[PDB]
């Protein structure tokens with residue numbers, strides 16, 4: 001008996017109703033510009049599968065960010081580009097400015113709009129209760145859009161969220177793991193970062209959807225309001241589930257496994273054990289209480305679910321009382 005199939009509650013067939021070329025990214029033709037149009041100023045960091053540089057466009061003298069791609073399948077490069085082009089102009093989505101190759105190394109490079117970003121290691125420790133609600137709302141705008149455009153991000157984490165706190169603007173970046181959602185498709189579970197992997201990835205359930213991003217959002221929200229980074233601190237993919245089980249309890253976990261008839265890895269049986277579902281007040285203490293509210297806990301609780309079908313959609317999340325003040329001020 002194989003695993004029970006699954007479909008997305010929302011935006012299920014959006015890609016099917018679009019032209020083939022929208023999602024069939026393998027056939028997409030790429031027009032490569034010249035890297036000589038950009039002069040690298042300084043290195044912004046050594047990314048996961050790239051080298052990221054701040055650069056200036058010598059044509060119009062404007063600051064950009066050049067992301068030199070590390071050698072990956074051309075198929076995946078076309079995917080990231082096509083997804084970036086499909087989402088351009090969208091709310092809080094990073095803007096792909098250009099696509100170039102170095103004249104010598106012939107190495108593919110992506111050029112993005114610049115964002116005056118403050119790292120979350122320095123920023124998140126300063127954010128107020130409102131700041132969290134505000135920026136969470138901005139990410140939801142991005143998630144709701146890309147989900148509506150038939151795209152899972154599959155790598156939602158603080159490092160992929162550039163925040164210009166001075167101008168209160170937010171950009172969701174790094175779409176290299178993003179993929180088009182098609183109903184019935186079995187996806188690779190080896191995506192996202194370990195601390196932000198959804199349970200479906202940890203138990204190897206391949207037929208997931210947009211709701212994967214909502215779990216990652218939940219992990220982010222938990223780490224911010226509780227000031228515990230990361231919230232689920234596992235030492236590997238297996239222990240990660242154990243860390244989650246020690247919070248959400250093992251009862252809902254095994255029910256989740258039974259519902260989708262998931263064949264659990266033989267390793268899991270001993271390390272999981274038996275754990276109760278903890279109350280969120282346990283994580284509330286003297287230093288984080290000013291960020292924790294009954295609305296926040298209610299909203300967080302509806303993001304962090306084993307059953308991906310039972311998690312809030314992005315739009316549902318935006319309509320939560322947690323964001324009532326934010327919505328009002330944006331009018």
Ligand SMILES: NCCCCn1cc(CCn2nc3c(Br)c(Br)c(Br)c(Br)c3n2)nn1
Nearest residue numbers: 044045052065112113114115117119162173
């Ligand atoms: N934990 C120690 C601190 C070092 C880690 N770290 C990572 C970063 C982010 C660097 N960065 N900025 C980017 C901008 Br702006 C754009 Br636009 C794009 Br696209 C990318 Br990819 C960026 N990466 N800071 N500290």
Ligand SMILES: [Cl-]
Nearest residue numbers: 147210313314
């Ligand atoms: Cl959604």
